[PDB]
Ligand SMILES: Nc1ncnc2c1ncn2[C@@H]1O[C@H](C[C@H](CC[C@@H]([NH3+])C(=O)O)[NH2+]CCCO)[C@@H](O)[C@H]1O
């Protein structure tokens with residue numbers, strides 16, 4: 201039939217917003233109605249189980265000697281409060297929104313245009329040793345978990361955001377992604393964040409190469425929709441020249 205501009209429709213009860221992730225009561229109410237994802241413990245930093253030469257004034261921009269090595273500045277930075285290279289410490293996350301996708305579950309989208317190499321969010325979670333990781337892999341498999349939330353931090357430490365983390369846990373995989381992980385040193389401690397790799401326009405889903413699953417043994421259908429989607433996610437090996 202002929203289509204027309206719909207009338208204005210205000211909702212019957214009040215809608216769910218990103219601040220409601222810091223309001224357990226309202227999140228749990230919204231979640232019951234399918235307007236928010238399942239509850240998890242929102243954390244501000246991971247749970248465990250260098251002075252630049254910039255002249256005091258963009259403060260600590262692209263030429264900052266700390267930034268170039270993926271090291272954040274300290275409070276002692278020559279630019280003090282105005283230092284732009286304390287993004288993890290100041291939780292200077294991008295304007296993001298959580299979305300419900302047709303096939304992948306929940307996801308994240310950009311609420312403003314994000315330039316290339318913009319910090320999106322820290323990937324926070326429980327930092328697991330190999331023993332605990334192996335125990336949880338078996339636990340989650342037996343429980344038939346639909347989604348996975350592991351990310352390697354270093355060779356002996358894996359971050360698990362299944363139970364505790366932030367909205368970065370909702371990031372989906374794409375075969376042609378628009379974000380990547382970067383591992384930054386913040387007061388001597390390695391942390392991992394998502395950063396854009398191109399200009400991401402407002403309203404676009406934020407995606408990454410989910411290496412943990414991509415190079416794992418088992419596979420699943422990939423719903424990324426990208427022009428050159430590899431078809432499935434998992435069961436892949438990195439390039440090697442054998443024998
Ligand atoms: N292209 C794709 N095709 C099929 N399935 C996909 C998918 N991209 C994501 N998935 C599903 O999401 C899981 C990953 C979760 C997000 C989970 C989120 N969607 C949710 O609903 O909670 N983030 C991991 C953060 C780093 O550890 C993943 O394992 C797969 O199940």
Ligand SMILES: [Zn+2]
Pocket residue numbers: 252253254259260261264265266273285
């Ligand atoms: Zn600097």
Ligand SMILES: [Zn+2]
Pocket residue numbers: 252259260273274277278279283284285
């Ligand atoms: Zn600085």
Ligand SMILES: [Zn+2]
Pocket residue numbers: 374375422423424425426428429430431432
């Ligand atoms: Zn794909």
